[PDB]
Amino acid sequence: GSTRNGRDSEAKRLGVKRFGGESVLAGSIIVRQRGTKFHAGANVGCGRDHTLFAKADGKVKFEVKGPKNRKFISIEA
Amino acid sequence: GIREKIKLVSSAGTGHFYTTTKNKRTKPEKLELKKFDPVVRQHVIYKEAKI
Amino acid sequence: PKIKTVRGAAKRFKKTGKGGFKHKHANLRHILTKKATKRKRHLRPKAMVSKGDLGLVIACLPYA
Amino acid sequence: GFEGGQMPLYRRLPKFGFTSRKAAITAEIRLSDLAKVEGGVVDLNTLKAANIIGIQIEFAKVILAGEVTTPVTVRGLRVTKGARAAIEAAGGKIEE
RNA sequence: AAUUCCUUGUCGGGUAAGUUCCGACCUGCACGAAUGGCGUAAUGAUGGCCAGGCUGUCUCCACCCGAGACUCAGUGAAAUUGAACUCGCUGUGAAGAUGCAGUGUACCCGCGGCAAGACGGAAAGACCCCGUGAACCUUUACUAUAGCUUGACACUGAACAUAUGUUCUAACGUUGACCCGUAAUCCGGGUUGCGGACAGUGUCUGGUGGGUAGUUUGACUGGGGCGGUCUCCUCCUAAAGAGUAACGGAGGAGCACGAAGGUUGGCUAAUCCUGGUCGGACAUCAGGAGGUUAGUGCAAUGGCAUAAGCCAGCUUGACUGCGAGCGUGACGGCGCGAGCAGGUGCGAAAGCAGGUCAUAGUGAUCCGGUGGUUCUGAAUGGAAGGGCCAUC
RNA sequence: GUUUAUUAAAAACACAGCACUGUGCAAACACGAAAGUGGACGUAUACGGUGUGACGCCUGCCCGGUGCCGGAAGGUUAAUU
RNA sequence: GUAACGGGGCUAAACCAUGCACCGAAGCUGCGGCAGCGACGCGCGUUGUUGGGUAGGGGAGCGUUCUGUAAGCCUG
RNA sequence: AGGACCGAACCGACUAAUGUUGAAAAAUUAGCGGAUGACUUGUGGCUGGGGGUGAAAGGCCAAUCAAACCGGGAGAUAGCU
RNA sequence: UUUUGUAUAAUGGGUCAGCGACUUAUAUUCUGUAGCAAGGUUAACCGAAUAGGGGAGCCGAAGGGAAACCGAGUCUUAACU
RNA sequence: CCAUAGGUUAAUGAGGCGAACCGGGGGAACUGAAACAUCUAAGUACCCCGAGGAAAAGAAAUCAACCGAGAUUCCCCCAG
Ligand SMILES: [K+]
Ligand SMILES: [K+]
Ligand SMILES: [K+]
Ligand SMILES: [K+]
Ligand SMILES: [K+]
Ligand SMILES: [K+]
Ligand SMILES: [K+]
Ligand SMILES: [K+]
Ligand SMILES: [K+]
Ligand SMILES: [K+]
Ligand SMILES: [K+]
Ligand SMILES: [K+]
Ligand SMILES: [K+]
Ligand SMILES: [K+]
Ligand SMILES: [K+]
Ligand SMILES: [K+]
Ligand SMILES: [K+]
Ligand SMILES: [K+]
Ligand SMILES: [K+]
Ligand SMILES: [K+]
Ligand SMILES: [K+]
Ligand SMILES: [K+]
Ligand SMILES: [Mg+2]
Ligand SMILES: [Mg+2]
Ligand SMILES: [Mg+2]
Ligand SMILES: [Mg+2]
Ligand SMILES: [Mg+2]
Ligand SMILES: [Mg+2]
Ligand SMILES: [Mg+2]
Ligand SMILES: [Mg+2]
Ligand SMILES: [Mg+2]
Ligand SMILES: [Mg+2]
Ligand SMILES: [Mg+2]
Ligand SMILES: [Mg+2]
Ligand SMILES: [Mg+2]
Ligand SMILES: [Mg+2]
Ligand SMILES: [Mg+2]
Ligand SMILES: [Mg+2]
Ligand SMILES: [Mg+2]
Ligand SMILES: [Mg+2]
Ligand SMILES: [Mg+2]
Ligand SMILES: [Mg+2]
Ligand SMILES: [Mg+2]
Ligand SMILES: [Mg+2]
Ligand SMILES: [Mg+2]
Ligand SMILES: [Mg+2]
Ligand SMILES: [Mg+2]
Ligand SMILES: [Mg+2]
Ligand SMILES: [Mg+2]
Ligand SMILES: [Mg+2]
Ligand SMILES: [Mg+2]
Ligand SMILES: [Mg+2]
Ligand SMILES: [Mg+2]
Ligand SMILES: [Mg+2]
Ligand SMILES: [Mg+2]
Ligand SMILES: [Mg+2]
Ligand SMILES: [Mg+2]
Ligand SMILES: [Mg+2]
Ligand SMILES: [Mg+2]
Ligand SMILES: [Mg+2]
Ligand SMILES: [Mg+2]
Ligand SMILES: [Mg+2]
Ligand SMILES: [Mg+2]
Ligand SMILES: [Mg+2]
Ligand SMILES: [Mg+2]
Ligand SMILES: [Mg+2]
Ligand SMILES: [Mg+2]
Ligand SMILES: [Mg+2]
Ligand SMILES: [Mg+2]
Ligand SMILES: [Mg+2]
Ligand SMILES: [Mg+2]
Ligand SMILES: [Mg+2]
Ligand SMILES: [Mg+2]
Ligand SMILES: [Mg+2]
Ligand SMILES: [Mg+2]
Ligand SMILES: [Mg+2]
Ligand SMILES: [Mg+2]
Ligand SMILES: [Mg+2]
Ligand SMILES: [Mg+2]
Ligand SMILES: [Mg+2]
Ligand SMILES: [Mg+2]
Ligand SMILES: [Mg+2]
Ligand SMILES: [Mg+2]
Ligand SMILES: [Mg+2]
Ligand SMILES: [Mg+2]
Ligand SMILES: [Mg+2]
């Protein structure tokens, strides 16, 4: 007859906006994410929704770093 | 919801107010906070009033 | 006869120097307490009509 | 303006502003217009006689638009800082 | 049962055999007392059932008499019709073929017959759905409204008594009587009686008002209806960027919090084992094992130890103006944001703070309200109203 | 008896009878912006409306709901002021 | 109505493997012609390339009646 | 005596067959009901369209009826063919 | 013609001839073309006057701001990097 | 009872028709609003009355804005 499902939320367009080696202007969003899947490295800020954004003009650099092998995003300015 | 809107009115007599919500039942004491009044351009005591 | 202005559009849009239209932002009439100051502050200045909408505005305002 | 029944743009946006009655009776005079009046006195009446401004204009302002190269007396009109410099540069007077 | 779904109920009668009929039973799905109950002689082109008679109704048709049909002479229609050199079959194919393929059959043309096909003719399917179509009907749908009804004021006055009561006459009524116009009963005038400021009518006003009128009465949908659904968040479907459907599979939201926010300083979980007043499986205490299997104000996912988890001090950055740049949207919008100015909190300081681990907790515009602001102010000064800012 | 002229003649409609109810006469009611007219040249043994439907035996319980009828102390309440 | 190779027929004219022939389209090439677009030269040549089309957009024309040109021109 | 009986005229229309580009836009043929009555019929009159009239079928109101016909608003509107 | 798709057994047409459907007015924008050019152009009207007159107007050469107002700037803000 | 109503006679005028235009008394709905009620259509269609060669309007208890204009009517602007 009827079903109790049939709901879903709008897709949030998360994920990587600027990949490795891409030249960005300061302020450019590099990744939108839920929590810190990626962490802010050098010249990268972490917004209130865990958005990583460039704090300097330069090139995006993904790196695995530290004792937990966490993924950091940096900007090579 | 439960929480009702209030205005925080400037003690400087500028007319300037902030607005916020308040659970009136759990907290009946008047909300008082130092907030920036942009008319006098100073932090002054703001006090709760009706919206 | 003369085309009639859509008078509601004339109250919402003003033509700018290069033939664009400025309008006031939606969402700043009421239900303001819940809105962030940042959000409301960005809604205060007038904005330009987007490319998708200029055709609709121009149709409504032949004497703008 | 019909969008298929979606609230159209000219209704989902707020009305703003009011129309000034004073703006309708206010004009702007270019520096180029100053040499088009007869006699080299630029008043409200001399501009109206030269068909620079409409007959119902009560207020007029000379702006720095175009150029002036004659001594013109400007009387009873507002003048911009740039227009005033240009009028005075060409030997004119701004009478208020 | 004109009512009984189950049901051809069951029992009895009638028949060789009876879902009907008649008589009962009561288990009345869902009789029932004037939208009458139960009877009832008579009546009925009324419904059901049985029997005698009667018969071509039938077994099962035969023959005959007439009117057509058939032939000749005369007259002379019609519906229909893209064009036709207009076969069968099996297959194919807008899925049921004269027309395609393959194959079989078939000399050319009438006439009388028959209706299997030409999805034959006839009527832009009446069912069904759709259209923000129509009509008429209904009502405790909406909005009106005739009518009915309420009061105020008017036409409408006078005494006396304590806004009401009584009395009065002169307005007003009279579809009482009489007189005259008059040859008329209508009507008007006159006289007189009876009512009498009442009634009645106008304007305004509350009620009532399917009597009447105009209309509304959503969409999605494996047809429609019924049910469910409609915005927002999380996961999966989703094919390792983004996005991605179904009445696909699972759950949540329509808040909470002046601390559960800011900052400084500090801290680290579940669970179990061993021992220990009451005390048990589980309370609190002690040690160890363990290593987040906990925790997160609330779903799920992604996060989280430098904790984002837990505790305390001091606090109001849950600041105001802005904003390089970027994300995400058809758009309206929504989001992230360093940095700048002002002023602030915490910290010795570096610093951190423009709410909350993040992602739901929402509503355009119009209309109007409140506060601020001489921006505007229809001769002028004001004001009203409008604008702008804040907010409802 | 009546009825769907032209697919329904009936169990439908009507009917005498019954009941409820309104109506005091310028009747109620109806047709009429109104004047008037019907009701009726009638007058409650009359007239209108409604339901039932010869006759026989009868017609039980419920007034909470919706109407209607009566009440009106009090609550609420229009124009007006 | 054969009716589950399209048929005839087939013991290969079936299937598998290998190989070389050939047939086969409006594909490609040849020859002649037309047009679009673009070069490179001087509207012409040379040369490259393109030319299936519904909705639909763009470009360029034919013919018809009428007015001027026309009291002209053609026409018993 | 009788909305009494049988049955012609007269009024009707229950059944069947025919007819269905009819002889006929409702009939013919054989049967059928009423036939002194709430009967039937001639002539004339009155009622008018949200109106009439209706022993009530939404029947009938000129072969037209859940709102006649004619003319007008009028080229209504038609997101449909 | 309509369609995802029609020899379709979906639609329309018996045939011929004639007629039969994107117009007209005004406004507005864009393109082409012509005139004039920081100007361009007149409307009614006058004029027998397609002339000539008529520049009332309209558009343009300045914008910004809700507005006062300022003006190659302006608005925003106490003030802008 | 005066009188009046009423009655008769005389004179004068009216009556009816007509396409539009005009002034007045009444006055829709379809339609549009993508439904619909406010609103629209529209004071339109239509009905009625009255007039004239035209009608109506008209000689400021009008505008204006501190300057001024000078009855009414009609046309172009103002201005979608
Ligand atoms: K980016
Ligand atoms: K029953
Ligand atoms: K009853
Ligand atoms: K064949
Ligand atoms: K046949
Ligand atoms: K009297
Ligand atoms: K009275
Ligand atoms: K009603
Ligand atoms: K479906
Ligand atoms: K199905
Ligand atoms: K805290
Ligand atoms: K700061
Ligand atoms: K009968
Ligand atoms: K009761
Ligand atoms: K009618
Ligand atoms: K179809
Ligand atoms: K068909
Ligand atoms: K054009
Ligand atoms: K041009
Ligand atoms: K600037
Ligand atoms: K209407
Ligand atoms: K519509
Ligand atoms: Mg998701
Ligand atoms: Mg690490
Ligand atoms: Mg506001
Ligand atoms: Mg001028
Ligand atoms: Mg049964
Ligand atoms: Mg039985
Ligand atoms: Mg039995
Ligand atoms: Mg038998
Ligand atoms: Mg029985
Ligand atoms: Mg019953
Ligand atoms: Mg009863
Ligand atoms: Mg009965
Ligand atoms: Mg076949
Ligand atoms: Mg034959
Ligand atoms: Mg036959
Ligand atoms: Mg057929
Ligand atoms: Mg059809
Ligand atoms: Mg109704
Ligand atoms: Mg309507
Ligand atoms: Mg409707
Ligand atoms: Mg639907
Ligand atoms: Mg993906
Ligand atoms: Mg992928
Ligand atoms: Mg897609
Ligand atoms: Mg914290
Ligand atoms: Mg927290
Ligand atoms: Mg949270
Ligand atoms: Mg309004
Ligand atoms: Mg004033
Ligand atoms: Mg004034
Ligand atoms: Mg009978
Ligand atoms: Mg019949
Ligand atoms: Mg019959
Ligand atoms: Mg009477
Ligand atoms: Mg009965
Ligand atoms: Mg009873
Ligand atoms: Mg066989
Ligand atoms: Mg070839
Ligand atoms: Mg080729
Ligand atoms: Mg080709
Ligand atoms: Mg081509
Ligand atoms: Mg010619
Ligand atoms: Mg008899
Ligand atoms: Mg009859
Ligand atoms: Mg007979
Ligand atoms: Mg009899
Ligand atoms: Mg008889
Ligand atoms: Mg019926
Ligand atoms: Mg008839
Ligand atoms: Mg009707
Ligand atoms: Mg019309
Ligand atoms: Mg039409
Ligand atoms: Mg189909
Ligand atoms: Mg084909
Ligand atoms: Mg087919
Ligand atoms: Mg066909
Ligand atoms: Mg065929
Ligand atoms: Mg069709
Ligand atoms: Mg056909
Ligand atoms: Mg300007
Ligand atoms: Mg006359
Ligand atoms: Mg509509
Ligand atoms: Mg006159
Ligand atoms: Mg004066």
From Swiss-Prot, chain A:
Which PROSITE patterns does the entry mention?
A: RIBOSOMAL_L27
The organism sits in which domain of life?
Bacteria
Q: Name one GO cellular component term.
A: cytoplasm
What are this entry's molecular-function GO terms? ribosome binding; rRNA binding; structural constituent of ribosome; tRNA binding
Q: Which Gene3D superfamilies match?
A: 2.40.50.100
Which parts of the sequence are annotated with region: Disordered?
Answer: 1-13
Which key words tag this protein in UniProt? Answer: Ribonucleoprotein, Ribosomal protein, RNA-binding, rRNA-binding, tRNA-binding
Which Pfam families does the record associate with it?
Answer: Ribosomal_L27 (PF01016)
Q: Which GO terms describe its biological process?
A: assembly of large subunit precursor of preribosome; cytoplasmic translation; cytosolic ribosome assembly; positive regulation of ribosome biogenesis; regulation of cell growth; ribosomal large subunit assembly
Subunit description: Part of the 50S ribosomal subunit. Cross-links to the 23S rRNA. Cross-links to the A and P site tRNAs.
Q: Which family does it belong to?
A: Belongs to the bacterial ribosomal protein bL27 family.
Entries under HAMAP family matching the protein = Ribosomal_bL27
PANTHER family, A to Z: LARGE RIBOSOMAL SUBUNIT PROTEIN BL27M (PTHR15893:SF0), RIBOSOMAL PROTEIN L27 (PTHR15893)
This chain belongs to the protein called: Large ribosomal subunit protein bL27
Swiss-Prot record, chain B:
Listed under GO cellular component are: cytoplasm; cytosol; cytosolic large ribosomal subunit
Any one Gene Ontology molecular-function term assigned to this protein's record: structural constituent of ribosome
UniProt xrefs under Gene3D superfamilies: Ribosomal protein L33
Domain of life per record: Bacteria
Report any Pfam family annotated for this entry: Ribosomal_L33
GO terms for biological process?
cytoplasmic translation; response to antibiotic; ribosomal large subunit assembly
Give the transmembrane ranges. Answer: none
Q: Which UniProt keywords apply?
A: Methylation, Ribonucleoprotein, Ribosomal protein, RNA-binding, tRNA-binding
Further comment found in the protein's record? Surface exposed on the 50S subunit.
- Tell me the protein family, please: Belongs to the bacterial ribosomal protein bL33 family.
Task: Describe, as the record does, how this protein assembles with itself and its partners.
Answer: Part of the 50S ribosomal subunit. Cross-links to the P and E site tRNAs.
Record PANTHER family: 54S RIBOSOMAL PROTEIN L39, MITOCHONDRIAL (PTHR15238), LARGE RIBOSOMAL SUBUNIT PROTEIN BL33M (PTHR15238:SF1)
What NCBIfam families has UniProt attached to this entry?
PRK00595.1, rpmG_bact
Query: What is the protein's given name?
Result: Large ribosomal subunit protein bL33
Q: What is the lineage of its organism?
A: Bacteria, Pseudomonadati, Pseudomonadota, Gammaproteobacteria, Enterobacterales
From Swiss-Prot, chain C:
UniProt-listed SUPFAM superfamilies:
L35p-like
**According to the UniProt entry, which residue ranges have a biased composition of type Basic residues?**
9-21
Q: Which Gene3D superfamilies match?
A: 4.10.410.60
Q: Which Gene Ontology molecular-function terms are recorded?
A: structural constituent of ribosome
GO biological-process terms attached to the record? cytoplasmic translation
Q: InterPro entries, per this entry?
A: Ribosomal_bL35, Ribosomal_bL35-like, Ribosomal_bL35_CS, Ribosomal_bL35_sf
One cellular component (GO) term of this entry: cytosolic large ribosomal subunit
Coiled coil (residue ranges): none
Looking at the record's lineage, which domain of life comes first? Bacteria
Q: Which cysteines are joined by disulfide bonds?
A: none
Q: List every stretch annotated Disordered.
A: 1-21
Q: Which UniProt keywords apply?
A: Ribonucleoprotein, Ribosomal protein
Q: Which family does it belong to?
A: Belongs to the bacterial ribosomal protein bL35 family.
Q: How does it assemble?
A: Part of the 50S ribosomal subunit.
Stated name of the protein: Large ribosomal subunit protein bL35
Q: Which organism was this protein described from?
A: Escherichia coli (strain K12)
Swiss-Prot record, chain D:
This protein is called Large ribosomal subunit protein uL15
- How does the record describe its quaternary structure? Part of the 50S ribosomal subunit. Contacts the 5S rRNA.
Query: One GO molecular function term?
Result: structural constituent of ribosome
- Job description of the protein: This protein binds the 5S rRNA. It is required for the late stages of subunit assembly, and is essential for 5S rRNA assembly onto the ribosome.
GO annotation terms (biological process): cytoplasmic translation
What family is reported? Belongs to the universal ribosomal protein uL15 family.
Q: Name one GO cellular component term.
A: cytosolic large ribosomal subunit
Q: What is the lineage of its organism?
A: Bacteria, Pseudomonadati, Pseudomonadota, Gammaproteobacteria, Enterobacterales
Keyword vocabulary terms for this entry: Ribonucleoprotein, Ribosomal protein, RNA-binding, rRNA-binding
